Amino acid sequence: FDIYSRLLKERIVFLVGPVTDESANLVVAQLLFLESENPDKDIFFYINSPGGSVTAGMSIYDTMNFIKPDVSTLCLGQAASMGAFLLSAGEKGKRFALPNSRIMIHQPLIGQASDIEIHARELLKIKEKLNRLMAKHCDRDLADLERDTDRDNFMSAEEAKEYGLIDQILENRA
Amino acid sequence: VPTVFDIYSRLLKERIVFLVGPVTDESANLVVAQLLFLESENPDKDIFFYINSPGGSVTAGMSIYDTMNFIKPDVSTLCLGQAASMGAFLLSAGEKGKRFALPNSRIMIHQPLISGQASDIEIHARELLKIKEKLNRLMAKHCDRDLADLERDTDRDNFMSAEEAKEYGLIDQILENRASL
Amino acid sequence: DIYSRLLKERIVFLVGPVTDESANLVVAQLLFLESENPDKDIFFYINSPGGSVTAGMSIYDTMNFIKPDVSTLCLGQAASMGAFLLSAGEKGKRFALPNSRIMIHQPGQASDIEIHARELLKIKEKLNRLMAKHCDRDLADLERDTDRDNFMSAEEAKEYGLIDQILENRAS
Amino acid sequence: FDIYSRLLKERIVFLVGPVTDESANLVVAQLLFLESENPDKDIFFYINSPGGSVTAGMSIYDTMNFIKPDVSTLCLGQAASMGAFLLSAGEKGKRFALPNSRIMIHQPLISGQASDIEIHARELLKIKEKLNRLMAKHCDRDLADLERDTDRDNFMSAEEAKEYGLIDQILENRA
Amino acid sequence: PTVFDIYSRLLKERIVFLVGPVTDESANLVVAQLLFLESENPDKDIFFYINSPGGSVTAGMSIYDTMNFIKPDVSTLCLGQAASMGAFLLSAGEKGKRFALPNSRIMIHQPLISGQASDIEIHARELLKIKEKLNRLMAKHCDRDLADLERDTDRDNFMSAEEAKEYGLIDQILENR
Amino acid sequence: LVPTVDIYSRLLKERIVFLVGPVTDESANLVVAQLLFLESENPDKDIFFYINSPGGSVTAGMSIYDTMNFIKPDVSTLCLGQAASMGAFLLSAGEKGKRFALPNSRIMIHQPLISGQASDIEIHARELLKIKEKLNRLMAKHCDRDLADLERDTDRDNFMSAEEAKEYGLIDQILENRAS
Amino acid sequence: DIYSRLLKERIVFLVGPVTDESANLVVAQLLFLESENPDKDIFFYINSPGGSVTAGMSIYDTMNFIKPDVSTLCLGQAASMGAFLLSAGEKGKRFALPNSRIMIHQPLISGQASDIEIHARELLKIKEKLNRLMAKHCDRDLADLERDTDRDNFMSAEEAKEYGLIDQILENRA
Amino acid sequence: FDIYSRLLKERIVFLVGPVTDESANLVVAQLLFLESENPDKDIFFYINSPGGSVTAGMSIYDTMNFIKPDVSTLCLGQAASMGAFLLSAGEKGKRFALPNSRIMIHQPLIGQASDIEIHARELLKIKEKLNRLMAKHCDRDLADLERDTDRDNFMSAEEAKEYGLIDQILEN
Amino acid sequence: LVPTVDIYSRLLKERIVFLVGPVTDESANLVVAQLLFLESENPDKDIFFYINSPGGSVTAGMSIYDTMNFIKPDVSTLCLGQAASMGAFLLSAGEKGKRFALPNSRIMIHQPLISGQASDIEIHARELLKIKEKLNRLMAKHCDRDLADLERDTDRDNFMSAEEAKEYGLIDQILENR
Amino acid sequence: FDIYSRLLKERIVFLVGPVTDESANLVVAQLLFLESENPDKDIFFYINSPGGSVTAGMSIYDTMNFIKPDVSTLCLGQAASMGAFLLSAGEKGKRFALPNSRIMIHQPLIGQASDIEIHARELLKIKEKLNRLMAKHCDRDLADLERDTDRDNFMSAEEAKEYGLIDQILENRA
Ligand SMILES: *[B]([O])([O])[C]([C][C]([C])[C])[N]C(=O)[C]([C][C]([C])[C])[N]C(=O)C1=[C][C]=C(O[C])[C]=C1Cl
Ligand SMILES: *[B]([O])([O])[C]([C][C]([C])[C])[N]C(=O)[C]([C][C]([C])[C])[N]C(=O)C1=[C][C]=C(O[C])[C]=C1Cl
Ligand SMILES: *[B]([O])([O])[C]([C][C]([C])[C])[N]C(=O)[C]([C][C]([C])[C])[N]C(=O)C1=[C][C]=C(O[C])[C]=C1Cl
């Protein structure tokens, strides 16, 4: 059993690199597994991601919120964009980041003019929805979210804790 | 893929079928194969089909569609991430009462897209018109509403949250966790 | 050359993609015909499938700015911006050849894309409104008739008010 | 065991996508193993093919009518061009199409010195004349009708193909 | 070669060339010539020499209408080939003054093309309108009934100068002056 | 491809100088040349600088800008089609009272743009910031405005109609024809 | 320019391949010389490997249509369609420099089967027509041309003169 | 049990080639596994790397310092930039290079003016952070790390010993 | 592409030489030609060299430099836009008393940039280094600045404003209007 | 077992083709595991390589001496640049070549002025380092080695032997 096959036996799941349909649904399949083999031990999601497909990241997000085991998120390397979004979305009290991590949040990115308007209102709805869910994960005013995702918002783990995006900083096991 | 059996296969043993990414004859027939396999394994229990797709080829999706229904097993559908175009068509094509979407998933519907002689172009454009009309009709049957709504609403990209699609008739229930049942 | 000669007969050509360079070339010709004589008609010949909006607007505002009455003639095709500039000719002096085709249709961070989509809709309405003026028609009719590609014969573009008359031979 | 090997344990064979030399010879090999395993139970050839190489598909054709077990075809998604041809040649009374399938029959598409061109064109017209023949045999249709109805892309639904004689019956559910 | 270049010298004979695919460039160049020669003298014939595979339909119609608009009769001469739009503009010449050289070939075929279903429909229906209009016009030129053009153009129809002259597509096959 | 009578040469002694498409060292310097030419022929007649540009290099644009302020003629600007970014920086740079625009032109203004070692990227960013502030202040002088208005209004793409660019102070008038 | 000077002396070149444009440039020079003096011969210098059959028949039928006799001279080479145009100069007036190279072969190229049929039939019409015309140029039987164009047939100026292609090989001015 | 698996068995982990998001996570997973096998027996980390991404390197860094086992580091061939960061991050007393392995330290090196200003602030912060951590691994001032890493600073194994970069160089 | 009245010849009639863009062989030689022709046409009048350049090759620039010093006429430099790298070196090489810049022109100076066997590489690096130190030589001369000042101020990009360029010694005055 | 694992059982490690970091480190790994397997058995390093990354070559080199077993090197086909260096690195007394092999030795080959100064100085330091280690492998005067590495110096197996690079040439098993 390959290194990840074993580390999946201590209920450790990883997210490395961008969040694509395939990387996301792989995370999702691993989560579903670890629940079906025990829906009451907590699952540990280690995130090192720059972000990626919002739809792909939402597959994960909704799966975490769906499954019975608590999903403890830990950011190593970087949790930027949807990576930061899935890090903040851990079970409250159970969100973590290594000391030298870095968390980055920002508003989203990227036919007939009719279709331009369609997709534009839709992308602004995505901006809205994400700002609200992030204010939730952080217990902050929606206004705080909108104002703090306008451009690139980089965070030491200290800042993301204070900002409420994570629960604690972990130098080591103690 | 990590081995545990590998992960998609271990979930296969929970009757979990995945469709990830766009619809190609390739992945469409892979999914068709898994569904026929789960019926040859258990022609009675429910097959659980997970959708995270932007759409794709129409006949590729029709092959899956026809694998559904035909098989005695009920194919429950659950969208995660996204299920647009033919993805939404299939999501609405699940066994009635067994079509679902997670809370923050996104469902989009739109008219059929395209990637010689005037005779050939006439022929194939009218073919596309019959296809667009057949799709509108089947979708009106999946959403249990009239047709006119489907033609008006699929003229341009029509996006919907998990709740607008349920009120449309694409799915039947939203699920936050298993308790939501 | 041939085009400088026809120019000396006050005939300006628009051919193909309305771009910055081609539109402003037409603009230089317009100002030079007004220079040489600000009181004789100009004859603007259009076979264009459209192009840049601001390019075409440089032209539009010039045609309306200069003292000469600018007549227009569509040959082959006038599409999008081409159809717009064909509509923009001096009223009573807009023409097309008996087998021309006139065709009208609509045109970073999420903050930026909001800015630009709002801009694009502003442009869409601006064009619908000017176009309705030209044809003397309802903005609500322009909206409906430019929603997808709208192809029109010379007879149809005439009844629609895009053009005044069809020129078969030089018997008006 | 992978998914397709397990499904071969059901005597189920697929042609997915274009008919190439390989993608057709693989099908021929599967039709062979099913005859070795058990030369009397029918094989069920499942067809979702846009058509393509006529030699590659002729291997499958001659193979279908060569082996002893009856071969029952099924159009899912699409049987276009040589797809529609092989679907048409399944063991008679055993040619089926799913209800929302689509079938298309056409004269052959395709894309040196004048003597070369003169050789190759007269090979292609002979092909074009062979294919309408074997189709008129498969559909119990006239040959003239196949000639006409293949001039350009003739599109037919499962019922239209059943009415042409291309398939025998449509299948909705297990029934 | 400078003789002015060669083509301007022959323009001083009212000789206008259409060589190669009918683009927008080339169609408007021919149109500008036609107008220049009517400006120079609106009563001497213009001589339009066509060797083209065809091209853009609307480009070619910019020429087709300029011919019937300018005062000069426009005599057409096929040398080499006049195919598709070439043959059409060739048969568009002033009747009695349409000519071909004896090894010119002439070919007529139906129109060709290389988004949303609603748009694909509009453009396919438009192309059908094109096909039918062009068929009626070719029937007028060749003095044929429309069904005959519909029938004789469904695929590629090649034609010798004898075949062409009979098809009413031209008036004479000129060996020499 | 420019017809002889070439046509822009002819116009050049209507003292009309064109700027079209991007502002580059080459095209900006060509305008720079035309300006000195018109001044030499007559350093007491107005020049009519017509602009249909989406902008470009800022040093290229400053060529035209600082030349505009150095010659003796009044450099009356006009916009047709679009003057965006530095193209809009120059339209507002015309002699006050002589900056105009046609009815359906489009102005747009926004902050700077851009397509090594930390120490080097440090320096390049510092200069880009000096230039954002420089552009903002000079812009603020052109529309007779507060520098803060310009920082606010140029943070992203600010599109303006001719009325809006007028009110903003970029242009002085809107011209529909000769009676205007 | 040198070539306009030479045009003054009624020499029309044909260098490189024979496209629609190069062939039309030659046709236009033919007409300009004829109009300028219809009763003086025109000298047509061919160094060409051949090319577009239709662009070639433009030059062919045009040489035949203008009053002036068109003498043809082969320097370098006249291949496939170049050779055919060489053999088409006014009978008695077709020449080649001593170290010329002539080549003649049947036509070649480098859709639907019904369309393909139509196209092949037309290609064969062209082949037969060209063999008939070439045979008339050469005063040979048609079967002679059929057999001898079946593949690439190479001829020295010598051999081109026997076959019926040219009339005189030209060593020096003597 | 392929060569690298067999060598993993007794707590040998290789970082070979650049520090990417994936090549780093593999070493991180190996460190976690070797701890899950025994948090009390040391882990030998073999480094032949030109460097790589900074995020991916701090992931391994904090994984090194978090887990219970001492992480000893061993440079073979080269440990440049980030490779030399993690080589210094080895448990003090337990950092080694081969005799002819070569070390290099350098300062880091890689929209609108706003976004540029932001990312520039972030990179200057990253540079500062790394210089401080490096000041402490070596016993050296922050001034020493600012000055000495201004450009590519090459080190023999011995000079690196001097610098507090490693502890000992190993012959046989 | 370039209007006749072409305009560049016509400003040459006024002793205006342009350097626009990167210093290449062909552009630097196109400048050398104009300096020689204007010295021949009248060696008793100033030539006006207008620089808007990011810089470029150092030998190509040295040709212009040595030509500025060879001929008799005072070559008066004017920065417009930017005179970066070599362009700045040229601008500073103008006759002392006749070097100017338009007020929003930006100036830049830095050390030489560049973009086989070990022997060959040592060899070429030696030639990059005497080049760096010779450029510092000449620039400290033009600025009436000591050499160390230049060696220090060119280790990385040093952007300067018109006023800053004046204070350095790179130009003499700034021009707003005549 | 693949064939290379089978021969690795016999304690044979190949260096074939270029010396990249990946390839050199795979050879390092095989050396280490053969030591683990048995540190009282010698290792057979089969070199048919043109050279590669000097640093990767050094990674293998510093291994050879450090592990306990004698690392014998055998040049078959060729050993050039870094391959030849590692060949000369075999346990002194155990550096072999095949008869039709050959050896090649030469000098190392391949921003701002300061950085190029730095990298230059470094490259010349690598040069000196390598020359001195060479003189040590072959016991020759350092003068020889640098003067005998100014450009490409080719050697038969015999020439390598008299040079000190290798020790024995081998015809057959006898
Ligand atoms: B992150 O950099 O992954 C960021 C997610 C934020 C909102 C937490 N990503 C996006 O916003 C992405 C950009 C790339 C990283 C993929 N944007 C989209 O995925 C995307 C793409 C296409 C469309 O069309 C509507 C929408 C979106 Cl939202
Ligand atoms: B959707 O993006 O999945 C859409 C199908 C919906 C309406 C259920 N996709 C298509 O319609 C595709 C477009 C590409 C994105 C693949 N269209 C076709 O596959 C197609 C192509 C050609 C013809 O007739 C010639 C019909 C069709 Cl349906
Ligand atoms: B169909 O698209 O499967 C069609 C075959 C039908 C009529 C049963 N395909 C072809 O006819 C192919 C065309 C390409 C799409 C591959 N044609 C040939 O393979 C071909 C090529 C060459 C010749 O003679 C030289 C004959 C043929 Cl049949």
Ligand SMILES: *[B]([O])([O])[C]([C][C]([C])[C])[N]C(=O)[C]([C][C]([C])[C])[N]C(=O)C1=[C][C]=C(O[C])[C]=C1Cl
């Ligand atoms: B011929 O191949 O030039 C043919 C002319 C006659 C005989 C019909 N040309 C065309 O049919 C052209 C196609 C060429 C580009 C190959 N048709 C058009 O250009 C065309 C097609 C479709 C539409 O409507 C979208 C417009 C036009 Cl202009």
Ligand SMILES: *[B]([O])([O])[C]([C][C]([C])[C])[N]C(=O)[C]([C][C]([C])[C])[N]C(=O)C1=[C][C]=C(O[C])[C]=C1Cl
């Ligand atoms: B506009 O997009 O034309 C804008 C001008 C505004 C800000 C007045 N142009 C730019 O911002 C350009 C964009 C690039 C295409 C070059 N930027 C510059 O011109 C520029 C930016 C920064 C620096 O040095 C840091 C030099 C230059 Cl020339």
Ligand SMILES: *[B]([O])([O])[C]([C][C]([C])[C])[N]C(=O)[C]([C][C]([C])[C])[N]C(=O)C1=[C][C]=C(O[C])[C]=C1Cl
């Ligand atoms: B010669 O090699 O140029 C040869 C001329 C004769 C003597 C054989 N050239 C051709 O035959 C050319 C082929 C290429 C050299 C261009 N043939 C054609 O141009 C051609 C081929 C086929 C058709 O029918 C569609 C028309 C034409 Cl014009």
Ligand SMILES: *[B]([O])([O])[C]([C][C]([C])[C])[N]C(=O)[C]([C][C]([C])[C])[N]C(=O)C1=[C][C]=C(O[C])[C]=C1Cl
């Ligand atoms: B070394 O070349 O590996 C070096 C590490 C030290 C000694 C400074 N690497 C970096 O500095 C890397 C640059 C490249 C390797 C890509 N820096 C980054 O990766 C980096 C830089 C800046 C930002 O903020 C935008 C993020 C990152 Cl991840």
Ligand SMILES: *[B]([O])([O])[C]([C][C]([C])[C])[N]C(=O)[C]([C][C]([C])[C])[N]C(=O)C1=[C][C]=C(O[C])[C]=C1Cl
């Ligand atoms: B500047 O970027 O123009 C700079 C000149 C000054 C400020 C130092 N030019 C260069 O550094 C160029 C690099 C290219 C961008 C042209 N360097 C040279 O031209 C050069 C460099 C080194 C040597 O000797 C090895 C000769 C030359 Cl000509």
Ligand SMILES: *[B]([O])([O])[C]([C][C]([C])[C])[N]C(=O)[C]([C][C]([C])[C])[N]C(=O)C1=[C][C]=C(O[C])[C]=C1Cl
């Ligand atoms: B041989 O061609 O393998 C040769 C080895 C000896 C005999 C000199 N290889 C090298 O010299 C290599 C060059 C190429 C193979 C890439 N030198 C280096 O790899 C090298 C050179 C310089 C520096 O410092 C910047 C590092 C490296 Cl790794």
Ligand SMILES: COc1ccc(C(=O)N[C@@H](CC(C)C)C(=O)N[C@@H](CC(C)C)B(O)O)c(Cl)c1
């Ligand atoms: C960002 O703001 C914008 C948005 C759009 C444009 C623009 O050019 N639109 C153009 C699109 C393309 C030709 C490029 C456009 O719509 N052209 C059409 C004109 C009319 C009838 C709507 B017809 O295709 O020429 C422009 Cl500058 C600026």
